[PDB]
Design a protein around this ligand. Structure first.
Ligand SMILES: *[C@@H]1O[C@H](CO)[C@@H](O[C@@H]2O[C@H](CO)[C@@H](O[C@@H]3O[C@H](CO)[C@@H](O)[C@H](O)[C@@H]3O)[C@H](O)[C@H]2NC(C)=O)[C@H](O)[C@H]1NC(C)=O
Ligand SMILES: *[C@@H]1O[C@H](CO)[C@@H](O[C@@H]2O[C@H](CO)[C@@H](O)[C@H](O)[C@H]2NC(C)=O)[C@H](O)[C@H]1NC(C)=O
Ligand SMILES: *[C@@H]1O[C@H](CO)[C@@H](O[C@@H]2O[C@H](CO)[C@@H](O)[C@H](O)[C@H]2NC(C)=O)[C@H](O)[C@H]1NC(C)=O
Ligand SMILES: *[C@@H]1O[C@H](CO)[C@@H](O[C@@H]2O[C@H](CO)[C@@H](O)[C@H](O)[C@H]2NC(C)=O)[C@H](O)[C@H]1NC(C)=O
Ligand SMILES: *[C@@H]1O[C@H](CO)[C@@H](O)[C@H](O)[C@H]1NC(C)=O
Ligand SMILES: *[C@@H]1O[C@H](CO)[C@@H](O)[C@H](O)[C@H]1NC(C)=O
Ligand SMILES: *[C@@H]1O[C@H](CO)[C@@H](O)[C@H](O)[C@H]1NC(C)=O
Ligand SMILES: *[C@@H]1O[C@H](CO)[C@@H](O)[C@H](O)[C@H]1NC(C)=O
Ligand SMILES: *[C@@H]1O[C@H](CO)[C@@H](O)[C@H](O)[C@H]1NC(C)=O
Ligand SMILES: *[C@@H]1O[C@H](CO)[C@@H](O)[C@H](O)[C@H]1NC(C)=O
Ligand SMILES: *[C@@H]1O[C@H](CO)[C@@H](O)[C@H](O)[C@H]1NC(C)=O
Ligand SMILES: *[C@@H]1O[C@H](CO)[C@@H](O)[C@H](O)[C@H]1NC(C)=O
Lengths: 366, 50, 269, 122, 50
């Protein structure tokens, strides 16, 4: 009061020094259930896989890609990304993702990377310079190998020109080595460019089969179809906390509500366009969001020449939200005044028919 | 540049409306005084000095 | 298949009046006993809408424009009006929306379908079984590119019925705002023959399909070798939407009871 | 409930304090007017139990003890005909409706039992 | 953007405070008139016409 009045001789009366506000305690954030994650539960551990020259391109439908189950899985051999961090994958959205899975030799896995060049990375599958995505490879020598060598894994080896990124070749014409036009048969200048590698269970590093997938992250003028798994914390019934109900924001104390909403309504607003009731997306219950307790701190005190004992008044604040008698009035919580049942002339007007005075062993009475 | 003009003209309109409200309050006080003087001097005889 | 029906009777396009229709919830906000004013694409009150009535003969279902949304209402009986067509070219060159509701499920798919001249659905009648059975799916012929696919749960609905007047009313509103294809719907029992009901009914949202494509025109699909058939007695209505302000009144339970067009008459203003 | 907003707002000046002082002055002058209109006599008069007021019947403007409130029939009719958000605080008045009714009853009893002598003196 | 929002909301608050001050002046005038009418008619007999 002395600093508010800018003086040392405070006179008898009630002065509004500062304001009170209940600060939040938690930052709970809730979101609906994460069901039907993605077809990744079957697109990775499938039985058969396409070749490298005829790689499949499976379009990812509307599903939230759970990248945590892939990065934290120690069963995979390598896990590298390009243009995006693996940790921020579960906190971003994408429009379309194409998963290209194929079988490649163990030594040719290094050439499958953006900016690389060679024989397989230029005639079978090529990545652009601005490729944004991740690459996942794992060993599969324990099930893809067989006694005597496998010859079912075909591959393209010779081509007349380099291929474009994200391109699949369908025509399997013979390669022309010389200037003589090939009439569809082999010869000294005409050879079949398609061959097949051999995978044996006794082969060491470099010859083992490794299943590598390519994840393409592209965005254009279209609504997002794949995002990251949004987490949901535990809600608190009655406490001044920060809430986030599916994009909403604010600070208030929740409570059980009786407003029967409609099956398609999520958050309700009263007059003057203010959010006053929201629905929990998980348990489908209705709960209002009242603003936290706030008011003004008035210091009821007699003249400085009389005494120094003061009385604090929290206007419009319940006594339970404040934390030496504590008496609750219809105008606010009053701390530091003894409530008496007598009636005297109003000396210091407080409000709602209550006044304070410095009388009789000697303290401020209300 | 259109936003600047909008802000300036809105401030001008606010100032004009404030001045008009103050002048209307003054004229309302004057009209109440005039009606009181009418009722006390024309429709009767007032012993109030001046 | 691909059949060009020609055996149809030529009738002029009929017209009717939509007294108070097309009032839908503009958002998912709950309101209790408060008159909210919103500005969005609504159906103007007492507007001139086009009327398509199938007689017996009469199987009109042409290509209709789709600008700023289209209000679709169909006084339907015996499950005739099933699905709709959406797109911008409808010639397998660009992407298009397909909505079909046959006797099993509401199949929705977004591909580059090749629509023929008169796509429809054929249903047999009294094939030694005394039960209408669908056997024709003449809607499209190929689909190269696809971006979205939805197969609802299978169910069994009746395909028979012969009444002197319509018994069911189906109202729909289709919009395309920022790629989201909003779909509103509401059903109510009516008893009329050849007139649109004069009442108020709020339209609730059903599903939002993020197709992300640009729709220019639409077309409906009615129920039924190349000639000779008998179509069920049914009619549907088409009404275009315009940006107008409406005052919606919510009751104590959060449902719209009546609306007022802000630019209809001085009293409404 | 913002931090940078307050940091940018504190650089404007004393607009906050000026508006607070204006609102406080309004709130004080409201109670001042309420006291100046009703509280004119510092003595609460009470009507005698006998209602022999020269034939007049003041049984519709004086308080009724049978009612939970000390307001009269006309006061009840007047009160019946008239029916803590983000930054909005409604402060209650100093003199409640009960005290206003007490002052009205005191003025009425004084006017009935003393004419106009209760205002000029005893 | 924060500065624009602060300026707009401060202008709105200033307009509201000005309207409240004008309305409070009107209410104070009405209350003074009511107190005068009380002190004259109730606590006496005013010969003022109307
Ligand atoms: C002064 O005025 C009051 C208000 O009009 C009078 O009280 C009213 O008196 C009448 C006449 O008795 C009541 O009507 C009837 O009263 C009987 C009970 O005695 C009741 O059973 C009947 O149904 C009918 O209501 C009337 O109720 C009553 N009103 C109230 C609010 O008390 C009062 O009598 C007057 N005093 C004198 C001296 O005339
Ligand atoms: C989200 O998941 C929770 C559980 O993880 C579901 O809550 C259960 O709902 C069933 C069906 O009403 C109840 O029988 C259980 O008792 C609930 N369990 C708990 C712990 O609350 C909830 O229904 C799911 N929500 C959605 C929209 O699927
Ligand atoms: C139905 O009518 C349409 C329109 O006349 C036919 O489409 C035409 O087909 C011919 C031959 O393929 C093309 O040369 C025309 O350019 C097409 N016209 C249009 C507007 O697309 C269609 O072939 C007919 N179908 C049947 C079964 O007769
Ligand atoms: C309604 O349409 C759906 C899809 O167009 C039909 O479902 C197909 O039925 C055939 C025949 O049994 C199956 O071979 C397909 O696999 C089904 N497709 C799907 C996506 O499930 C359904 O049979 C149709 N119902 C009627 C009565 O015609
Ligand atoms: C297949 O892999 C997915 C993750 O890629 C995993 O969730 C699932 O459990 C695996 N299937 C089996 C049978 O282990
Ligand atoms: C303060 O809180 C208590 C406990 O909930 C309640 O009983 C009391 O009515 C509250 N006081 C006010 C003024 O709301
Ligand atoms: C006032 O009266 C109440 C009701 O009996 C009692 O509980 C309280 O102690 C009294 N206070 C004083 C100061 O006498
Ligand atoms: C609708 O327009 C048609 C075409 O001119 C006209 O014949 C009909 O009378 C109109 N109906 C109404 C209700 O305006
Ligand atoms: C009648 O129903 C039976 C049983 O589904 C079916 O086998 C038969 O083909 C139907 N009749 C005709 C004419 O198709
Ligand atoms: C199908 O989509 C791909 C990628 O968006 C595009 O390259 C191709 O041209 C499309 N096909 C047709 C027929 O438009
Ligand atoms: C968008 O709509 C226009 C018609 O206004 C159409 O020509 C175009 O193909 C649509 N799609 C895109 C990507 O522009
Ligand atoms: C709201 O719902 C309750 C419970 O279903 C019902 O009793 C009440 O009549 C409804 N309100 C209105 C206005 O119909």
């Amino acid at each position: 009061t002395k600093c508010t009045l800018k003086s040392f001789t405070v006179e008898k009366g009630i002065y509004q020094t500062s304001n009170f506000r209940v600060q939040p305690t938690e930052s709970i954030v809730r979101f609906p259930n994460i069901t039907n994650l993605c077809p990744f539960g079957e697109v990775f551990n499938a039985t058969r896989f396409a070749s490298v020259y005829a790689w499949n391109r499976k379009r990812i439908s509307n599903c939230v890609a759970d990248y945590s189950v892939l990065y934290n899985s120690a069963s995979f051999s390598t896990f590298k990304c390009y243009g995006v961090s693996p940790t921020k994958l579960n906190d971003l959205c994408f429009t379309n993702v194409y998963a290209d899975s194929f079988v490649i030799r163990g030594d040719e896995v290094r050439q499958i990377a953006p900016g690389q060049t060679g024989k397989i990375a230029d005639y079978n599958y090529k990545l652009p310079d601005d490729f944004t995505g991740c690459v996942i490879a794992w060993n599969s020598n324990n099930l893809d190998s067989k006694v005597g060598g496998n010859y079912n894994y075909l591959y393209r080896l010779f081509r007349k020109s380099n291929l474009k990124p994200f391109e699949r070749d369908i025509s399997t014409e013979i390669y022309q080595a010389g200037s003589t036009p090939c009439n569809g048969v082999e010869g000294f200048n005409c050879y079949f460019p398609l061959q097949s590698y051999g995978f044996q269970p006794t082969n060491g590093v470099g010859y083992q089969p490794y299943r590598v997938v390519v994840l393409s992250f592209e965005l254009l003028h279209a609504p997002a179809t794949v995002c990251g798994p949004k987490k949901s914390t535990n809600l608190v019934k009655n406490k001044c906390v920060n809430f986030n109900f599916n994009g909403l924001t604010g600070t208030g104390v929740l409570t059980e509500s009786n407003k029967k909403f409609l099956p398609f309504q999520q958050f309700g607003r009263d007059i003057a366009d203010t959010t006053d009731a929201v629905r929990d997306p998980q348990t489908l219950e209705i709960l209002d969001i009242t603003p936290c307790s706030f008011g003004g701190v008035s210091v009821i005190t007699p003249g400085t020449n009389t005494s120094n004992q003061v009385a604090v008044l929290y206007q419009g604040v319940n006594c339970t939200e404040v934390p030496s008698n504590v008496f609750q009035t219809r105008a606010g919580c009053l701390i530091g005044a003894e409530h008496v049942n007598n009636s005297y002339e109003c000396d210091i007007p407080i409000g709602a028919g209550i006044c304070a005075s410095y009388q009789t062993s000697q303290s401020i009475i209300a | 540049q259109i936003d600047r003009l909008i802000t300036g003209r809105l401030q001008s309109l606010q100032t004009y409306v404030t001045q008009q409200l103050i002048r209307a309050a003054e004229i309302r006080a004057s009209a109440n005084l005039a009606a009181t003087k009418m009722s006390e001097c024309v429709l009767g005889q007032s012993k109030r000095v001046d | 298949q691909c059949v060009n029906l020609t055996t149809r009777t030529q009738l002029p396009p009929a017209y009717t009046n939509s007294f108070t229709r097309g009032v839908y919830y503009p958002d998912k906000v709950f309101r209790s006993s408060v008159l909210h004013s919103t500005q969005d694409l609504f159906l103007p009150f007492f507007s001139n809408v086009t009327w398509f009535h199938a007689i017996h003969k009469r199987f009109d279902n042409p290509v209709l424009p789709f600008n700023d949304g289209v209000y679709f209402a169909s006084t339907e009986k015996s499950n005739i009006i099933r699905g709709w067509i959406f797109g911008t070219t409808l010639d397998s060159k660009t992407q298009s929306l397909l909505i079909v509701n046959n006797a099993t499920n509401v199949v929705i798919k977004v591909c580059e379908f090749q629509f023929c001249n008169d796509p429809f659905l054929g249903v047999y009648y009294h094939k030694n079984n005394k039960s209408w059975m669908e056997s024709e799916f003449r809607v499209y012929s190929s689909a190269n590119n696809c971006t979205f696919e939805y197969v609802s749960q299978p169910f069994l609905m009746d395909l028979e019925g012969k009444q002197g007047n319509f018994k069911n009313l189906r109202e729909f509103v289709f919009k395309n705002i920022d790629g989201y294809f909003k779909i509103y719907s509401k059903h109510t029992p009516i008893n009329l023959v050849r007139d649109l009901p004069q009442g108020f009914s709020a339209l609730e949202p059903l599903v939002d399909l993020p197709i992300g494509i640009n729709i220019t025109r639409f077309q409906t699909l009615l129920a039924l070798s190349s000639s000779g058939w008998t179509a069920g007695a049914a009619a549907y209505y088409v009404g275009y939407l315009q940006p107008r302000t409406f005052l919606l009144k919510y009751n104590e339970n959060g449902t719209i009871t009546d609306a007022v067009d802000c630019a209809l008459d001085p009293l409404s203003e | 409930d913002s931090t940078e907003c307050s940091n940018l707002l504190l650089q404007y000046g004393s607009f906050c304090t000026q508006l607070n002082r204006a609102l406080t002055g309004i709130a004080v002058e409201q109670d001042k007017n309420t006291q100046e209109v009703f509280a004119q006599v510092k003595q609460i008069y009470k009507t005698p139990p006998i209602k022999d007021f020269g034939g007049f019947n003041f049984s519709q403007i004086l308080p009724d003890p049978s009612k939970p409130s000390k307001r009269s029939f006309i006061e009840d009719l007047l009160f019946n005909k008239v029916t803590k958000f983000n930054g909005l605080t409604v402060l209650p008045p100093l003199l409640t409706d009960e005290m206003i009714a007490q002052y009205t009853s005191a003025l009425l009893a004084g006017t009935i039992t003393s004419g106009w002598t209760f205002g000029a003196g005893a």
